[PDB]
Amino acid sequence: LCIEKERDALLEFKRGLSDNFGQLSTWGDEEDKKECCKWKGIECNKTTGHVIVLDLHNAFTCSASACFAPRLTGKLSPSLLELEYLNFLDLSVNEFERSEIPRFICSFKRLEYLNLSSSFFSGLIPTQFKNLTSLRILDLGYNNLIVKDLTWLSHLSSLELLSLGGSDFQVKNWFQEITKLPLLKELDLSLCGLSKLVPSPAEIANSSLISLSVLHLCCNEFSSSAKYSWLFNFSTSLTSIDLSNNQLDGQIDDRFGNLMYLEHLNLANELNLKGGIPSSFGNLTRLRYLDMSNTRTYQWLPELFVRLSGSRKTLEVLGLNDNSMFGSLVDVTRFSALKRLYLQKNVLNGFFMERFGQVSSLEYLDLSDNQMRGPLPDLALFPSLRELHLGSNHFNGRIPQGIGKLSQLKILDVSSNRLEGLPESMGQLSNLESFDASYNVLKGTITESHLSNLSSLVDLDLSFNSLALKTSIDWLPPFQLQVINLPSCNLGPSFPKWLQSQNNYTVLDISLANISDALPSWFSGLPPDIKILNLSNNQISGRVSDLIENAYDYMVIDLSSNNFSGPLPLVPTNVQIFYLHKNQFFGSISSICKSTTGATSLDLSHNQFSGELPDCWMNATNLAVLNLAYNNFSGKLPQSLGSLTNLEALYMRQNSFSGMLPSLSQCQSLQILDLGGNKLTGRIPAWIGTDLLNLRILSLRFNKFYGSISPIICQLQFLQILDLSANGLPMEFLVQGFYGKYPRHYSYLGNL
Amino acid sequence: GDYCGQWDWAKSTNYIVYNNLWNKNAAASGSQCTGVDKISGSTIAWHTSYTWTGGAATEVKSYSNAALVFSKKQIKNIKSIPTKMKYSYSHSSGTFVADVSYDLFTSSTASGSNEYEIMIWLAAYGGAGPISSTGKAIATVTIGSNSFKLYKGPNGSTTVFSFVATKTITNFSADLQKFLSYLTKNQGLPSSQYLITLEAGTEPFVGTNAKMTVSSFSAAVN
Numbered sequence: 012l013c014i015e016k017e018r019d020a021l022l023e024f025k026r027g028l029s030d031n032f033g034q035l036s037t038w039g040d041e042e043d044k045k046e047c048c049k050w051k052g053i054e055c056n057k058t059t060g061h062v063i064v065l066d067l068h069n070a071f072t073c074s075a076s077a078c079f080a081p082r083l084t085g086k087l088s089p090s091l092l093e094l095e096y097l098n099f100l101d102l103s104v105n106e107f108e109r110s111e112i113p114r115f116i117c118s119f120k121r122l123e124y125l126n127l128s129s130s131f132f133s134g135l136i137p138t139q140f141k142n143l144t145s146l147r148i149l150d151l152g153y154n155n156l157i158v159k160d161l162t163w164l165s166h167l168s169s170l171e172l173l174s175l176g177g178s179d180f181q182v183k184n185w186f187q188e189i190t191k192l193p194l195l196k197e198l199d200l201s202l203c204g205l206s207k208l209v210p211s212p213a214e215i216a217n218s219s220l221i222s223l224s225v226l227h228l229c230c231n232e233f234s235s236s237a238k239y240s241w242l243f244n245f246s247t248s249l250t251s252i253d254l255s256n257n258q259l260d261g262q263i264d265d266r267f268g269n270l271m272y273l274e275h276l277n278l279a280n281e282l283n284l285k286g287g288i289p290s291s292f293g294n295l296t297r298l299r300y301l302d303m304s305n306t307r308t309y310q311w312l313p314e315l316f317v318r319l320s321g322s323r324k325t326l327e328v329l330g331l332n333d334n335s336m337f338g339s340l341v342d343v344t345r346f347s348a349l350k351r352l353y354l355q356k357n358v359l360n361g362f363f364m365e366r367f368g369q370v371s372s373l374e375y376l377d378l379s380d381n382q383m384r385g386p387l388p389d390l391a392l393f394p395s396l397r398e399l400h401l402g403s404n405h406f407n408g409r410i411p412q413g414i415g416k417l418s419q420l421k422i423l424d425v426s427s428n429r430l431e432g433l434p435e436s437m438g439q440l441s442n443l444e445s446f447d448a449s450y451n452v453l454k455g456t457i458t459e460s461h462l463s464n465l466s467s468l469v470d471l472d473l474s475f476n477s478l479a480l481k482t483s484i485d486w487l488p489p490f491q492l493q494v495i496n497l498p499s500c501n502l503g504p505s506f507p508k509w510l511q512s513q514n515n516y517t518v519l520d521i522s523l524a525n526i527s528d529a530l531p532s533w534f535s536g537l538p539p540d541i542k543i544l545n546l547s548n549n550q551i552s553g554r555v556s557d558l559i560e561n562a563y564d565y566m567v568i569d570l571s572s573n574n575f576s577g578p579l580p581l582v583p584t585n586v587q588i589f590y591l592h593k594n595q596f597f598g599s600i601s602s603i604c605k606s607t608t609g610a611t612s613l614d615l616s617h618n619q620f621s622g623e624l625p626d627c628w629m630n631a632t633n634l635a636v637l638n639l640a641y642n643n644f645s646g647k648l649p650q651s652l653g654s655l656t657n658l659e660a661l662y663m664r665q666n667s668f669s670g671m672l673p674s675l676s677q678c679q680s681l682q683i684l685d686l687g688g689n690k691l692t693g694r695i696p697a698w699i700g701t702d703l704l705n706l707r708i709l710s711l712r713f714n715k716f717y718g719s720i721s722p723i724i725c726q727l728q729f730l731q732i733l734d735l736s737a738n739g740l741p742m743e744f745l746v747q748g749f750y751g752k753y754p755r756h757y758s759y760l761g762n763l
Numbered sequence: 764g765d766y767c768g769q770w771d772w773a774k775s776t777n778y779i780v781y782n783n784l785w786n787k788n789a790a791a792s793g794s795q796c797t798g799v800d801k802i803s804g805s806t807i808a809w810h811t812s813y814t815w816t817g818g819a820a821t822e823v824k825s826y827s828n829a830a831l832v833f834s835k836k837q838i839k840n841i842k843s844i845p846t847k848m849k850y851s852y853s854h855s856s857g858t859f860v861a862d863v864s865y866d867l868f869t870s871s872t873a874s875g876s877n878e879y880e881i882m883i884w885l886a887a888y889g890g891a892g893p894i895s896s897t898g899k900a901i902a903t904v905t906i907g908s909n910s911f912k913l914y915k916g917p918n919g920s921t922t923v924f925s926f927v928a929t930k931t932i933t934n935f936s937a938d939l940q941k942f943l944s945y946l947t948k949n950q951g952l953p954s955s956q957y958l959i960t961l962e963a964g965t966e967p968f969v970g971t972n973a974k975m976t977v978s979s980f981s982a983a984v985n
């Protein structure tokens with residue numbers, strides 16, 4: 012069906028642009044690419060072969076704090092005039108030469124859809140746009156163009172949609188010039204500086220009274236009903252109004268309720284919509300989407316539901332999140348088409364009751380970071396939930412045995428509530444990806460039926476609860492979980508057997524469980540990319556020298572408070588905090604820093620360690636918390652300690668250290684330095700008062716320091732504790748990759 | 764001296780220049796090696812260099828940053844957050860995607876989880892752009908001879924405000940208190956938030972044989 016001149020043209024057009032990522036790879040003069048209409052972004056008329064559709068529009072994907080777009084970064088070539096009959100040209104979200112809109116585009120005379128939005132087209136519209144009389148829909152939004160004369164518009168009578176958002180809009184009288192269009196259903200003027208340009212009552216009188224249906228006015232600095240009052244002249248026939256991000260400080264005009272067909276209203280991210288929706292909202296009848304997020308509307312919730320009762324049956328999405336809305340949540344089931352309701356981060360202090368005797372169709376519900384109390388309702392009434400957010404409240408009771416009826420449920424967050432137990436019926440969810448019921452007051456034993464039939468689980472979080480989790484001995488779980496936080500839960504007297512079967516996890520927190528056997532032999536084949544292993548505070552045994560694997564890019568290893576034994580496991584290469592305290596290790600620590608390590612905090616205290624400290628601490632410069640206290644250590648303090656450019660706390664109490672104290676001049680920043688019971692001798696040196704200006708605790712008790720005291724120690728003046736007996740003379744560190752981009756800050760100062 | 768470790772750093776008096784390849788394993792088959800050149804009182808000088816190619820090119824790979832440690836002070840009680848920056852940047856071949864940005868954060872408590880994030884991008888290349896829930900700017904602001912477009916979007920719990928320079932700036936200087944206070948008056952950041960971290964570096968998405976040179980990075984909280 013393909014026409015020759017058109018491929019030739021399309022190919023020369025491609026020759027200018029640099030696709031770089033593809034998109035235009037399927038374009039060529041090749042025999043294999045010989046029908047141009049089966050190419051990406053071209054569609055041809057079925058009978059006449061002339062191309063009718065060209066869209067190189069590109070969306071963009073957002074990851075983390077950044078979002079990315081494959082922009083075309085090319086030159087836009089006039090050979091396209093040869094296409095002759097295209098009703099659709101879309102070059103959205105592409106960067107060309109960030110230049111004038113090319114005038115040849117106006118020389119088409121058969122266009123109906125021109126979308127150049129969200130590119131970088133700059134300068135100002137060519138007046139030649141008045142020649143494009145055939146244009147039904149124009150989008151030129153979110154470019155860098157200035158708009159001072161709107162004269163051409165009068166000629167495009169055919170328009171039914173015009174976006175001029177994101178302009179240097181400086182036109183005194185758009186009202187006249189925009190009412191000149193007989194069929195404009197939709198207008199976008201967002202970020203056009205509309206507030207500076209206010210339609211006069213007079214200019215509104217000399218106007219065409221168009222039947223306008225959808226309006227976008229976001230990003231205009233209105234702040235009062237005045238600069239947007241012109242809107243209500245289309246009261247006859249409106250459906251959407253987007254007045255989001257307007258610094259709106261005032262009560263909403265009761266006019267909105269009066270509009271008969273309003274079905275979509277976004278007033279989100281305002282300054283102060285004092286109160287909230289008025290009583291005229293009871294007259295709205297059909298409505299579908301309301302958004303007063305981040306408006307500080309202080310309104311009683313069920314009176315809002317009264318004032319939306321005009322639309323029990325039409326309202327689909329209600330977004331009242333991050334506001335000061337008080338009250339209780341009663342009979343949300345009455346809203347039969349409500350699918351999304353977002354009430355998080357309000358001031359609600361009441362019960363989640365629902366007694367209507369009807370069933371809701373809520374798929375997404377968020378009542379987090381409130382003050383709510385009372386028990387949950389029978390969730391069997393809310394079967395369509397895909398994600399149920401309820402954290403940071405004060406709910407109580409057990410979780411209802413009807414939660415087992417939530418099949419489409421993927422996410423459940425009931426953290427930081429005072430709930431008291433789990434039903435077996437949530438061994439039926441099978442789509443529950445992430446289940447977090449941490450910091451509650453749950454009591455009881457969780458059997459394998461509790462977690463039966465839940466194949467799609469990847470996050471389990473039951474932290475700091477009064478709970479127990481014992482499976483049957485020969486139970487095989489249907490789930491492999493990347494995140495496993497089960498602190499303060501007794502998982503079995505025996506090391507939980509079910510973890511032999513999990514091989515995809517990357518963060519293991521089994522701490523404060525009651526466990527007492529030796530480390531099983533199978534557990535050595537622990538997944539190769541674990542970043543957080545917290546086995547501490549148990550009675551686990553085995554010599555972990557050969558029972559842990561090394562350099563797996565650890566991030567947090569805490570093996571403290573156990574009955575582990577042996578010599579120190581050789582420290583993995585990329586770990587940052589490595590805690591071995593409160594165990595039965597012994598031997599040299601001559602292996603610590605033979606290999607380079609970036610650990611920022613290691614704690615080796617309360618062991619049976621011995622020997623002379625190796626002189627390799629420049630192979631671990633990154634330490635800021637060193638804790639060797641409460642071990643039997645004999646030897647000179649290694650001069651390598653001078654190599655700790657940042658060290659915040661140095662714990663050396665209760666060793667048998669002898670000799671003089673080594674040069675610590677270069678470790679200018681430190682806050683804690685105790686060497687108690689260390690049997691160390693020499694004069695108290697000058698650099699404690701001289702280079703170590705930073706300092707808060709200094710303990711040199713029960714040593715052998717000969718010589719007099721320098722008075723210069725009075726020049727620190729932030730030192731809070733000084734103890735130098737029996738001699739004869741707000742702090743923390745960071746783990747960097749913890750939360751992805753964001754570091755984590757850990758506190759280590761404790762008993763003062 | 765330049766150093767290639769994933770979470771390596773280098774405390775330097777007033778400023779700490781962290782290198783974070785916090786996203787190295789993005790299947791991006793490459794390496795990055797950062798490093799400090801000069802110290803001169805309030806002004807520092809540093810560089811990095813990298814070659815991240817392929818895998819996930821939708822993603823950031825690293826944020827080598829120049830950071831301030833300061834008396835964490837409430838937004839209300841900052842008179843001036845003066846800063847300046849001068850750099851030039853060198854790359855080769857094709858598919859160079861990356862940005863150059865400041866990154867500030869705020870929380871309720873002096874030691875709290877990041878609640879607000881303020882990015883101020885001096886440069887956007889190859890299609891790199893800030894997280895935006897809309898794809899479109901909430902507003903355009905002008906500060907100290909620079910024109911900025913503001914985007915806002917969610918990074919999990921953090922609310923990320925991002926200013927993008929219309930002029931890709933190779934010589935920035937300004938008072939970031941004007942930016943912080945603009946947000947407090949107009950978009951809705953509480954003045955009670957505590958300013959936590961000030962960082963300035965680059966986020967690369969793809970690139971080959973790249974090297975940034977920072978002639979100076981003076982910065983303060985007074």
Ligand SMILES: *[C@@H]1O[C@H](CO)[C@@H](O[C@@H]2O[C@H](CO)[C@@H](O[C@@H]3O[C@H](CO[C@H]4O[C@H](CO[C@H]5O[C@H](CO)[C@@H](O)[C@H](O)[C@@H]5O[C@H]5O[C@H](CO)[C@@H](O)[C@H](O)[C@@H]5O)[C@@H](O)[C@H](O[C@H]5O[C@H](CO)[C@@H](O)[C@H](O)[C@@H]5O[C@H]5O[C@H](CO)[C@@H](O)[C@H](O)[C@@H]5O)[C@@H]4O)[C@@H](O)[C@H](O[C@H]4O[C@H](CO)[C@@H](O)[C@H](O)[C@@H]4O[C@H]4O[C@H](CO)[C@@H](O)[C@H](O)[C@@H]4O)[C@@H]3O)[C@H](O)[C@H]2NC(C)=O)[C@H](O)[C@H]1NC(C)=O
Binds near residue numbers: 305
């Ligand atoms: C000229 O060219 C221009 C340049 O392209 C054209 O401009 C484009 O027009 C398109 C329309 O033609 C636009 O496409 C539509 O986008 C909307 C955007 O809203 C949604 O996404 C926003 C960002 O989140 C998504 O984005 C990224 C990238 O994909 C993802 O990383 C995210 O994960 C997320 O993806 C989610 O969405 C899918 C969709 O189902 C899910 O299934 C996924 O699992 C993901 O979770 C965001 O703004 C919206 O979210 C709001 O609410 C969220 C929670 O609900 C909250 O997190 C957000 O922060 C935001 O919250 C705000 O509101 C809440 C209340 O809701 C408040 O509480 C809060 O305070 C905030 O105020 C939303 O997620 C999108 O909805 C559309 O999707 C429909 O249509 C497309 C096809 O067109 C399908 O692909 C969709 O699946 C869906 O299709 C059917 O399904 C719908 C029901 O699910 C149904 O209702 C539909 O009608 C349909 O039947 C489109 O994706 C495009 O954005 C726009 N681009 C630009 C740059 O302008 C221009 O049109 C053109 N000119 C012309 C044509 O004249």
Ligand SMILES: *[C@@H]1O[C@H](CO)[C@@H](O[C@@H]2O[C@H](CO)[C@@H](O[C@@H]3O[C@H](CO[C@H]4O[C@H](CO[C@H]5O[C@H](CO)[C@@H](O)[C@H](O)[C@@H]5O)[C@@H](O)[C@H](O)[C@@H]4O)[C@@H](O)[C@H](O[C@H]4O[C@H](CO)[C@@H](O)[C@H](O)[C@@H]4O[C@H]4O[C@H](CO)[C@@H](O)[C@H](O)[C@@H]4O)[C@@H]3O)[C@H](O)[C@H]2NC(C)=O)[C@H](O)[C@H]1NC(C)=O
Binds near residue numbers: 427498499545872875
């Ligand atoms: C490997 O695992 C082990 C064990 O899992 C880790 O070691 C543990 O780490 C835990 C986390 O740090 C830590 O728990 C925190 O302890 C802090 C200090 O506790 C003080 O307050 C409690 C009050 O508890 C009492 O009430 C509760 C509730 O009924 C009871 O359950 C208790 O039994 C008590 O009756 C006192 O008892 C203590 O004596 C101290 O005075 C707590 O502050 C902290 O709680 C904070 O976070 C909670 C998160 O949900 C939150 O609920 C709580 O309100 C606290 O809120 C904090 O954050 C907010 C916001 O900034 C702030 O305003 C608050 O002021 C507060 O800072 C935790 O409870 C364990 O104690 C600790 N165990 C050991 C042996 O050390 C180990 O760290 C880990 N390995 C690594 C490397 O991390």
Ligand SMILES: *[C@@H]1O[C@H](CO)[C@@H](O[C@@H]2O[C@H](CO)[C@@H](O[C@@H]3O[C@H](CO)[C@@H](O)[C@H](O)[C@@H]3O)[C@H](O)[C@H]2NC(C)=O)[C@H](O)[C@H]1NC(C)=O
Binds near residue numbers: 265291292
């Ligand atoms: C919700 O809608 C009702 C009905 O539209 C509103 O009440 C009605 O308001 C109209 C105003 O135009 C009244 O109609 C006219 O009133 C004048 C006197 O003002 C009268 O002379 C005319 O003959 C005509 O009736 C109408 O009487 C009134 N009440 C009805 C219809 O029962 C109401 O104001 C809206 N609610 C809110 C909160 O605004």
Ligand SMILES: *[C@@H]1O[C@H](CO)[C@@H](O[C@@H]2O[C@H](CO)[C@@H](O)[C@H](O)[C@H]2NC(C)=O)[C@H](O)[C@H]1NC(C)=O
Binds near residue numbers: 057058059063
């Ligand atoms: C595709 O091309 C055909 C003809 O090449 C178009 O058909 C004409 O359609 C109009 C209105 O439907 C009629 O008045 C003409 O009589 C038709 N002509 C012929 C020869 O059939 C058709 O509309 C085109 N469609 C598109 C989408 O381009």
Ligand SMILES: *[C@@H]1O[C@H](CO)[C@@H](O[C@@H]2O[C@H](CO)[C@@H](O)[C@H](O)[C@H]2NC(C)=O)[C@H](O)[C@H]1NC(C)=O
Binds near residue numbers: 117142
């Ligand atoms: C816009 O439309 C008018 C109307 O057709 C065009 O003006 C014509 O220009 C040609 C050029 O030689 C003349 O022969 C006609 O007599 C003109 N007609 C009228 C009514 O003035 C104008 O050229 C068009 N602009 C573009 C860029 O095509």
Ligand SMILES: *[C@@H]1O[C@H](CO)[C@@H](O[C@@H]2O[C@H](CO)[C@@H](O)[C@H](O)[C@H]2NC(C)=O)[C@H](O)[C@H]1NC(C)=O
Binds near residue numbers: 491493515
């Ligand atoms: C094992 O865990 C990894 C992640 O640590 C899973 O990998 C990703 O899973 C998400 C889930 O939707 C996908 O979107 C990604 O495409 C996956 N990426 C990679 C590189 O695999 C992985 O699927 C898990 N495997 C099993 C069998 O559970």
Ligand SMILES: *[C@@H]1O[C@H](CO)[C@@H](O[C@@H]2O[C@H](CO)[C@@H](O)[C@H](O)[C@H]2NC(C)=O)[C@H](O)[C@H]1NC(C)=O
Binds near residue numbers: 605606607626627630
């Ligand atoms: C600091 O770490 C380096 C490794 O980065 C150690 O160097 C290795 O030493 C062994 C024998 O001791 C040699 O066989 C290797 O060839 C060396 N490797 C490298 C890369 O140099 C070094 O010994 C450590 N320093 C101290 C004082 O322990």
Ligand SMILES: *[C@@H]1O[C@H](CO)[C@@H](O)[C@H](O)[C@H]1NC(C)=O
Binds near residue numbers: 220244
């Ligand atoms: C326009 O709106 C004002 C106030 O809303 C009203 O007084 C005026 O008569 C309206 N004109 C038309 C034609 O609707």
Ligand SMILES: *[C@@H]1O[C@H](CO)[C@@H](O)[C@H](O)[C@H]1NC(C)=O
Binds near residue numbers: 439464
């Ligand atoms: C899971 O539950 C469903 C519903 O009763 C049932 O069809 C299925 O066989 C169950 N599977 C197992 C392994 O119990």
Ligand SMILES: *[C@@H]1O[C@H](CO)[C@@H](O)[C@H](O)[C@H]1NC(C)=O
Binds near residue numbers: 643666
């Ligand atoms: C262990 O320390 C004690 C003092 O705390 C000391 O008496 C004993 O000799 C030490 N063990 C040695 C030196 O082997």
